[PDB]
Write an enzyme that holds these catalytic residues in place. Structure first.
Site, PDB file in Angstrom:
ATOM      1  N   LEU A  42       0.847  -1.217   0.000  1.00  0.00           N
ATOM      2  CA  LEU A  42       0.000   0.000   0.000  1.00  0.00           C
ATOM      3  C   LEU A  42       0.879   1.263   0.000  1.00  0.00           C
ATOM      4  O   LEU A  42       0.349   2.287  -0.413  1.00  0.00           O
ATOM      5  CB  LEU A  42      -0.923  -0.031   1.225  1.00  0.00           C
ATOM      6  CG  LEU A  42      -1.891  -1.213   1.332  1.00  0.00           C
ATOM      7  CD1 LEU A  42      -2.708  -1.145   2.615  1.00  0.00           C
ATOM      8  CD2 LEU A  42      -2.822  -1.258   0.139  1.00  0.00           C
ATOM      9  N   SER A  54       5.336   3.149   0.887  1.00  0.00           N
ATOM     10  CA  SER A  54       6.808   3.028   1.101  1.00  0.00           C
ATOM     11  C   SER A  54       7.304   4.053   2.128  1.00  0.00           C
ATOM     12  O   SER A  54       7.473   5.213   1.729  1.00  0.00           O
ATOM     13  CB  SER A  54       7.542   3.170  -0.197  1.00  0.00           C
ATOM     14  OG  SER A  54       7.479   1.962  -0.930  1.00  0.00           O
ATOM     15  N   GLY A  81       9.859   3.042   6.807  1.00  0.00           N
ATOM     16  CA  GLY A  81       8.418   2.997   6.495  1.00  0.00           C
ATOM     17  C   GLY A  81       8.144   2.231   5.209  1.00  0.00           C
ATOM     18  O   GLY A  81       8.691   2.640   4.163  1.00  0.00           O
ATOM     19  N   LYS A 139       2.906  -2.700   8.827  1.00  0.00           N
ATOM     20  CA  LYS A 139       3.972  -1.683   8.652  1.00  0.00           C
ATOM     21  C   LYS A 139       5.290  -2.234   9.209  1.00  0.00           C
ATOM     22  O   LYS A 139       5.243  -2.857  10.278  1.00  0.00           O
ATOM     23  CB  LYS A 139       3.526  -0.405   9.359  1.00  0.00           C
ATOM     24  CG  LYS A 139       4.597   0.655   9.561  1.00  0.00           C
ATOM     25  CD  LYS A 139       3.989   2.037   9.740  1.00  0.00           C
ATOM     26  CE  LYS A 139       4.700   2.887  10.768  1.00  0.00           C
ATOM     27  NZ  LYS A 139       3.752   3.335  11.814  1.00  0.00           N
ATOM     28  N   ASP A 177      -0.947  15.336  15.958  1.00  0.00           N
ATOM     29  CA  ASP A 177      -0.824  15.287  14.475  1.00  0.00           C
ATOM     30  C   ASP A 177      -2.167  14.910  13.849  1.00  0.00           C
ATOM     31  O   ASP A 177      -2.170  14.154  12.842  1.00  0.00           O
ATOM     32  CB  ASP A 177       0.276  14.337  14.006  1.00  0.00           C
ATOM     33  CG  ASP A 177       0.633  14.533  12.538  1.00  0.00           C
ATOM     34  OD1 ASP A 177       0.343  15.630  12.008  1.00  0.00           O
ATOM     35  OD2 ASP A 177       1.172  13.583  11.925  1.00  0.00           O
ATOM     36  N   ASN A 202      -4.574  11.702   8.447  1.00  0.00           N
ATOM     37  CA  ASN A 202      -4.426  10.800   9.614  1.00  0.00           C
ATOM     38  C   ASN A 202      -5.787  10.330  10.126  1.00  0.00           C
ATOM     39  O   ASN A 202      -5.859   9.850  11.269  1.00  0.00           O
ATOM     40  CB  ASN A 202      -3.642  11.514  10.710  1.00  0.00           C
ATOM     41  CG  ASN A 202      -2.182  11.578  10.345  1.00  0.00           C
ATOM     42  OD1 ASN A 202      -1.742  10.809   9.486  1.00  0.00           O
ATOM     43  ND2 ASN A 202      -1.439  12.457  11.002  1.00  0.00           N
TER      44      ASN A 202
HETATM   45  C1  LIG Z   1      -6.939   1.406  11.878  1.00  0.00           C
HETATM   46  C2  LIG Z   1      -5.548   0.812  11.833  1.00  0.00           C
HETATM   47  C3  LIG Z   1      -4.847   1.342  10.637  1.00  0.00           C
HETATM   48  O1  LIG Z   1      -4.134   2.353  10.687  1.00  0.00           O
HETATM   49  N1  LIG Z   1      -4.985   0.612   9.512  1.00  0.00           N
HETATM   50  C4  LIG Z   1      -4.463   0.921   8.246  1.00  0.00           C
HETATM   51  C5  LIG Z   1      -3.316   1.708   8.096  1.00  0.00           C
HETATM   52  C6  LIG Z   1      -2.888   1.992   6.817  1.00  0.00           C
HETATM   53  C7  LIG Z   1      -3.593   1.519   5.722  1.00  0.00           C
HETATM   54  C8  LIG Z   1      -4.711   0.749   5.958  1.00  0.00           C
HETATM   55  N2  LIG Z   1      -5.169   0.452   7.195  1.00  0.00           N
END
Ligand SMILES: */C=C\C(=O)Nc1ccccn1
Length: 299
Positions: free
Chosen positions: A22, A24, A25, A46, A138, A143
């Protein structure tokens, strides 16, 4: 202070299939299949840019500490970590990505009910962080994540602090920050209220950039002189007057998240009275045992 009895769940690397990248951490979408449970939980995973950086690992585990410590429907919770060479954070997959990208992609199909309902849900999430003595520092549209169009959650606790807080530098988002934050590195629940105001403005302008093209060194001064973001086109004075209250110099003159919940939720009962939008009235692999993180509890 009360003891933090949050469970930090350690997961075997074998318990999840990374499925796609998804970002690019670096961030993967995946499935988590807890040991002989007969459930599949869509997850975001992550891990670090460089495995053996001690500065990087301190960071992600601080994120894990906070996310382990939160249980609220409008806040991202940690599912677990995996202690591989690169530490993996595992959270609930938010399939529709960040609310900023989302308003931009779908501006021509987003109606007042959605916008105001988001404003409420974010106010609820932030009010829960305030109950838990927690300062996000933040908050921005970037976010807030979209589980469904009907359901958003606050994320990225990279800067979050348990309990004023007095910080010491680092690349920080000036355009979302209270005055007292830019001047005295002070942060409170009420400095999060300011960032909430900017976040609502992001949404009401369908993701437009605050103080677009103004360099951040100027911002401190501009706000001192009395200037604020403009009334977004769609916004009744009712909605805009709320945003402006979030940008008062007296922090205690700003509204409280519990109030913002109330005010936005009254407006959400009659949305076309508070937000005026052109044509507002008009607006997966073979996997059988899948269950959203939100229905997956463990004691
Ligand atoms: C709710 C947890 C969270 O941050 N999930 C997430 C992060 C990034 C992309 C998709 N889902």
């Amino acid at each position: 202070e009360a003891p933090n009895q949050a469970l930090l769940r350690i997961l075997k690397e074998t318990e999840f299939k990374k499925i796609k990248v998804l970002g690019s951490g670096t961030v993967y979408k995946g499935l988590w299949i807890p040991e002989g449970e007969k459930v599949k939980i869509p997850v975001a995973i992550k891990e670090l840019r460089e495995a053996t950086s001690p500065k990087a690992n301190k960071e992600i585990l601080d994120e894990a500490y906070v996310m382990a410590s939160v249980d609220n429907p409008h806040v991202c919770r940690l599912l677990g970590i995996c202690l591989t060479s690169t530490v993996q954070l595992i959270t609930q997959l938010m399939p529709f990505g960040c609310l900023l990208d989302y308003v931009r992609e779908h501006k021509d199909n987003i109606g007042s009910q959605y916008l105001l309902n988001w404003c409420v849900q974010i106010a609820k999430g932030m009010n829960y962080l305030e109950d838990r003595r927690l300062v996000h520092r933040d908050l921005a549209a970037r976010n807030v994540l979209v589980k469904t169009p009907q359901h958003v959650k606050i994320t990225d606790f990279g800067l979050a602090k348990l309990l004023e807080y007095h910080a010491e530098g680092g690349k920080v988002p000036i355009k979302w920050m209270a005055l007292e934050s830019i001047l005295h590195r002070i942060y409170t629940h009420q400095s999060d209220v300011w960032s909430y105001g900017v976040t609502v403005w992001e949404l009401m302008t369908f993701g437009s950039k605050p103080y677009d093209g103004i360099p951040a060194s100027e911002i401190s001064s501009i706000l001192e002189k009395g200037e604020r973001l403009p009334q977004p086109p769609i916004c009744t004075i009712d909605v805009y007057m709320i945003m402006v209250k979030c940008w008062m110099i007296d922090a205690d003159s700003r509204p409280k998240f519990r109030e913002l919940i109330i005010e936005f939720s009254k407006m959400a009962r009659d949305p076309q009275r508070y937000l005026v939008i052109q044509g507002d009235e008009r607006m997966e692999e073979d996997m059988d045992d899948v269950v959203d993180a939100d229905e997956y509890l463990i004691p």
